[PDB]
C-alpha cells in the first residue's frame, strides 16, 4: 500500500492521497516519500490506532466509542411511530454530525467560554474547538486565557450544515432579541 502510493505520487506529485495501514509504525515510511505533504490534503488512516483507541476511551468513560462512531459517520434520522421513547431520542443524536465554518466579527477578542454561551443560548449550537494561529494548530475546549482573532475556523456539532451558517451571519447590535432562530440570515448588518 506504501508502494502503491509511491507510483501514484510518482505519476502526479500534486494529488490528494489517503491510505489505510495496519501497524502504527508504518506511518514513518510515508514521510520518507518527498512529495508527501499532509499540509496539502494527504492523510493516513491507521486501523490499530483507531480500533483500540475507541476501545481505550470507553475504559475511561463508557459508551464514548458509540458517541464518536455515530458522530462522524452518516446516519439516517427517521422517527417511526412503532418505536419507544429511548429509541427515538437515540436516533435524534445519530443525525448530529461534524461541521466546520468561519465565525462572525462579533466573536473577536472574546474567550472560548464566553463564545460558546452565545452559540448555545441564542444560535442553539455546540462548540468543540478553534483553529489557533501560530504553523496553525487545533485545540479542543481551551481555557479563558486564549482569545479569538479574525477569520478563525469553528468546530461545530449540529443537525445539519444549513444551521451552521448562522454562526457566519451574526451581529451583537442587529441580531440581539430574536425569538425564532430561523429568522437570522441577514448579511447587511
Amino acid at each position: 500500500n506504501i508502494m502503491r502510493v509511491i507510483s501514484i505520487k510518482n505519476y502526479h506529485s500534486d494529488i490528494k492521497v489517503i491510505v489505510q495501514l495496519l501497524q502504527y509504525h508504518n506511518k514513518a515510511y510515508l514521510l520518507n516519500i518527498p512529495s508527501w505533504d499532509w499540509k496539502r490534503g494527504d492523510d493516513a488512516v491507521c486501523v490499530a490506532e483507531l480500533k483500540l483507541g475507541f476501545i481505550a476511551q470507553s475504559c475511561l468513560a463508557p459508551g464514548f466509542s458509540t458517541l464518536m462512531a455515530n458522530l462522524f459517520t452518516m446516519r439516517s434520522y427517521k422517527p417511526t411511530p412503532e418505536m419507544s421513547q429511548w429509541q427515538t431520542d437515540y436516533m435524534r443524536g445519530t443525525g448530529m454530525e461534524m461541521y466546520t465554518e468561519y465565525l462572525s466579527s462579533a466573536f473577536n477578542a472574546l474567550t472560548f467560554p464566553e463564545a460558546a454561551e452565545l452559540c448555545f443560548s441564542k444560535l442553539k449550537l455546540l462548540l468543540l474547538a478553534i483553529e489557533v494561529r501560530q504553523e496553525s494548530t487545533l485545540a479542543i475546549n481551551p481555557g479563558p486565557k486564549v482569545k479569538i482573532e479574525n477569520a478563525t475556523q469553528g468546530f461545530f456539532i449540529a443537525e445539519s450544515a444549513e444551521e451552521v451558517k448562522r454562526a457566519f451571519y451574526y451581529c451583537k447590535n442587529c441580531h440581539a432579541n430574536v425569538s425564532d432562530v430561523r429568522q437570522i440570515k441577514k448579511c447587511k448588518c
Binding site: 506504501i2 510518482n10 515510511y29 514521510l31 520518507n32 516519500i33
Partner: protein, 323 residues
C-alpha cells in the same frame, strides 16, 4: 596473511562471536570510509553467496591498511549458514537486526561511507510481478530521507527492471523509455539482475569475452581456486614464497578526480587526448572513461570519449593502475 594462491588476504577460522557487535560497540568503533551491506533475508531463505561480494574487496593488489572494512546488516540465523565461507576474511563486522531500524544505520555510520549496498534474498517472482523489490525501494528512500548533523552512495539489487521508475525524485522520463536510457542506471545507483541473461549471448559470439569480464571483476579468480574450493577444506592459509607473492603486482580498477594532483592542469580547459598520452608515458596509467557531474550529487557515465572533448575541473575518470 594470504591464500595458497597468493591472490587474496586470509585469516584463521574465527567463530561468529568474534566479529559480532551490538549498537554500542558499532558506534564506539570509529568507523569511517567503509562498505555497508543491507541484507534482507529470513532464517529459512536461500543462500546468495556473500563471499563473491567480499572476495574482490580483499584483493592482494590492495595493501592491508587500504582495505575497506565491510559491515553486513541482516538476520543472524541467515548469516550463520554463510559464515563458513566468510570467516576467512579480514575486517568484517556483522550487525544483527533489520536494516530499516535507523538506530542500526546511525550506529554503523552511513553518514561516513564509501558505498552502501542493498541486497534481497527472499522468495521473489512468486506471488506478484511489480511489488517484488518493495523492501529494496523502501530502504533506498529511507536512507535518502534520513538526515543527521541525503548525499549518500547507494546501489540496489533489482529483479524487475520497470521498478527502476520508483527510485529517484527528479523523474524527467516516460514509463515507455527503455532501462539503459533512464537516469539512475546511468548514475549507477541501480543495477538489474537481467543483465546476466544478456551475457549469455556475448559468451556465444565472442569467445574471449567472459574471460575478460571475470579478470576485471573478481580481481584474480584463477582456475586453481576452483579446484581448491572443491575439496571442502576452504581457503587454505600459508604466508607463501617470494615467487608466489610476485603475482599480486597486477592491474586494478580505480577512479581519479581532477581537482588536485599533477593532472589538475588539464582540468581547467584541456582535452581527453592530452590527458591520455601524458598519463600513459610518465606514470604508466590507462584511462577508460569519464564520470561527470550532471549539471553546472548525481554523476552520469561516459565510456571512451573522442580526442577533442573538453574536461571540467569537477570531473572523475575510470583508470587501470599498476601499483
Amino acid at each position: 596473511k594470504f591464500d595458497s594462491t597468493g591472490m587474496f588476504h586470509w585469516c584463521p577460522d574465527r567463530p561468529l562471536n568474534d566479529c559480532l557487535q551490538d549498537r554500542s560497540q558499532a558506534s564506539a568503533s570509529g568507523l569511517r570510509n567503509h562498505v555497508v551491506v543491507c541484507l534482507f533475508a529470513d532464517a529459512a531463505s536461500p543462500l546468495i553467496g556473500l563471499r563473491n561480494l567480499v572476495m574482490p574487496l580483499r584483493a592482494s593488489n590492495f595493501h592491508y591498511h587500504e582495505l575497506k572494512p565491510t559491515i553486513i546488516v541482516g538476520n543472524l540465523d541467515y548469516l550463520h549458514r554463510e559464515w563458513k565461507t566468510l570467516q576467512n576474511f579480514p575486517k568484517l563486522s556483522i550487525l544483527p537486526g533489520s536494516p530499516l531500524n535507523r538506530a542500526n544505520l546511525r550506529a554503523v555510520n552511513i553518514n561516513l561511507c564509501d558505498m552502501c549496498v542493498i541486497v534481497s534474498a527472499k522468495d521473489r517472482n512468486m506471488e506478484d510481478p511489480n511489488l517484488v523489490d518493495k523492501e529494496a525501494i523502501l530502504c533506498s528512500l529511507n536512507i535518502k530521507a534520513m538526515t543527521f548533523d541525503a548525499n549518500v552512495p547507494l546501489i540496489t539489487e533489482l529483479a524487475n527492471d520497470s521498478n527502476v521508475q520508483f527510485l529517484d525524485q527528479d523523474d524527467d522520463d516516460d514509463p515507455d523509455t527503455e532501462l539503459y536510457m533512464t537516469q539512475p542506471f546511468a548514475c549507477g545507483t541501480a543495477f538489474a539482475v537481467s543483465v546476466l541473461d544478456s551475457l549469455m549471448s556475448t559468451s556465444y559470439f565472442n569467445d574471449n569475452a567472459l574471460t575478460l569480464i571475470r579478470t576485471l571483476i573478481t580481481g584474480g579468480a584463477t582456475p586453481e581456486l576452483e579446484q581448491i574450493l572443491a575439496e571442502g577444506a576452504g581457503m587454505r592459509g600459508g604466508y607463501c614464497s617470494p615467487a608466489v607473492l610476485a603475482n599480486r603486482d597486477r592491474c586494478r580498477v580505480a577512479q581519479i578526480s581532477l581537482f588536485d594532483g599533477p593532472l589538475a592542469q588539464f582540468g581547467q580547459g584541456g582535452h581527453y587526448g592530452e590527458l591520455f598520452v601524458y598519463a600513459l608515458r610518465h606514470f604508466g596509467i590507462l584511462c577508460i572513461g569519464l564520470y561527470r557531474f550532471r549539471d553546472t550529487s548525481k554523476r552520469y557515465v561516459i565510456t571512451n570519449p573522442p580526442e577533442d572533448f573538453p574536461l571540467l575541473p569537477t570531473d572523475q575518470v575510470y583508470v587501470l593502475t599498476y601499483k
